[PDB]
Write a structure and sequence with these properties.
Chain A: This is Beta-2-microglobulin. Chain A: Component of the class I major histocompatibility complex (MHC). Involved in the presentation of peptide antigens to the immune system. The complex is a heterodimer of chains A (98) and B (269). Chain A has 98 residues and is mostly beta strands. Chain A is 0% helix and 48% strand. The N and C termini of chain A lie far apart (33 Å). Chain B folds into two domains: 173 residues, MHC class I-like antigen recognition-like (Murine Class I Major Histocompatibility Complex, H2-DB, Chain A, domain 1); 86 residues, Immunoglobulins (Immunoglobulin-like, Sandwich), CATH 2.60.40. Helix content of chain B is 24%, strand content 41%. Chain B starts with a strand and ends with a strand. The relative contact order of chain B is 0.11. Classes of the chains: A mainly beta (98), B alpha+beta (269). The complex binds N-palmitoylglycine, chloride ion (CL) and sodium ion (NA). Sodium ion (NA) binds next to loops of chain B.
Chain lengths: 98, 269
């Protein structure tokens, strides 16, 4: 189908209290309009940036969103995704692997 | 050395709040080298790759991109009715060229409408192929005018390869700089089973492989791969997971091969 396939991952291997970048990558979706929000404990993270709209060889669209952050062991990080193929927003939790 | 130049063009009736309706992203060997969008109306190099570019080259890139934007706008205002139309619509184009190791050339030129194949142009035979009877209309009009074929034979086989050679030379420092992955192996237990995840962070160039081994023998049968996905600094990320009984958790190695590693690396939990 054409719903977003979403991965959340940190730029570097994560460790508590060390500056890093949190990534949310959505791919395989259509149409290209899409909402992607990085959050810390349900709060939108500040300084987030999005890639220029682009697509895979099979024409499906994709977008990377990223923001600087300092992971805290106390916190939940996640990526909230809204798309026309989605009746409700989809929340993808980051698995820190501390 | 085999090398590639690719442009990814998107026009959109409904790109979303504050987003440009027409975008171009250019790639050299899976590195973004420049971009254009309908808000800035400017084609710009990625200075981390192309640090010392002349304005005149990018003046040219800008005007060609603005023409592409006009053409996408023209088509988006015609194809929906022709296909019979009511929702949002998209138009896409991918074109470029390859220079094979022996110096021979390949051109690519493909279009899609609402995310489905629409039209392709084959440089070596100078022929079009239409994806359906509606696209066939545009095919016949373009071949009968007899202008597109010669322009894009030139565009793909001459201009693209020249620009590829220029980007390869101007961006050689960034293009050749190998970045070793930082590999993290993790394991989490749930419902009594241990999922082992091998994550490779921040490698360049893009090609990588990741395998899971037990007692030195490969175990592909129960491995899931997440795919190679981008970081924002032009490096990449890739992952592999495998489920195993918590008793045998010390017995698995993930094997990472990457051009930055003289020998494949073995990592455990
Ligand atoms: C580095 C990214 C920004 C610079 C990109 C350079 C711009 C090149 C794009 C021009 C291609 C647009 C043509 C697409 C529509 C079309 O088929 N028109 C008919 C035709 O051009 O013959
Ligand atoms: Cl180890
Ligand atoms: Na716009």
């Amino acid at each position: 189908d054409l719903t977003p396939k979403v991965q959340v991952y940190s730029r570097f291997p994560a460790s508590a209290g060390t500056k890093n970048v949190l990534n949310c990558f959505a791919a395989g979706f259509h149409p290209p309009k899409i909402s992607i929000t990085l959050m810390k404990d349900g709060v939108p993270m500040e300084g987030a940036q999005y890639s220029d709209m682009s697509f895979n060889d099979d024409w499906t669209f994709q977008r990377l969103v990223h923001a600087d952050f300092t992971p805290s062991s106390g916190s939940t990080y996640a990526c909230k995704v809204e798309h026309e193929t989605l009746k409700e927003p989809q929340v993808y939790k980051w698995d820190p692997e501390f | 050395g085999s090398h590639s130049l690719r442009y990814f063009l998107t026009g959109m009736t409904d790109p979303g709040p504050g987003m440009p309706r027409f975008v171009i992203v250019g790639y050299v060997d899976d590195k973004i080298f420049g971009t254009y969008n309908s808000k800035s109306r400017t084609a710009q190099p990625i200075v981390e790759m192309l640090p010392q570019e002349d304005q005149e080259h990018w003046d040219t890139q800008t005007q060609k991109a603005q023409g592409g934007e006009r053409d996408f706008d023209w088509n988006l205002n015609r194809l929906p009715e022709r296909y019979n139309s009511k929702g949002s619509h998209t138009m896409q184009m991918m074109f470029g060229c390859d220079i094979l190791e022996d110096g021979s050339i390949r051109g690519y030129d493909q279009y899609a409408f609402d995310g489905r194949d629409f039209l392709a142009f084959d440089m070596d035979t100078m022929t079009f192929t239409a994806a359906d009877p509606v696209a066939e209309i545009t095919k016949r009009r373009w071949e009968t005018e007899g202008t597109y074929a010669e322009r894009w034979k030139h565009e793909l086989g001459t201009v693209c390869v020249q620009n590829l050679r220029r980007y390869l030379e101007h961006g050689k420092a960034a293009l050749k700089r190998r970045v070793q992955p930082e590999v993290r192996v993790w394991g989490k237990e749930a419902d009594g089973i241990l999922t082992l995840s091998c994550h490779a962070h921040g490698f360049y160039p893009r090609p990588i492989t990741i395998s899971w081994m037990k007692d030195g023998m490969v175990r592909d049968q129960e491995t899931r791969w997440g795919g190679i996905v981008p970081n924002s600094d032009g490096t990449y990320h890739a992952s592999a997971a495998i489920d195993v009984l918590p008793e045998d958790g010390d017995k698995y190695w993930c094997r990472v091969e990457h051009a930055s590693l003289p020998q494949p690396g073995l990592f455990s939990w």
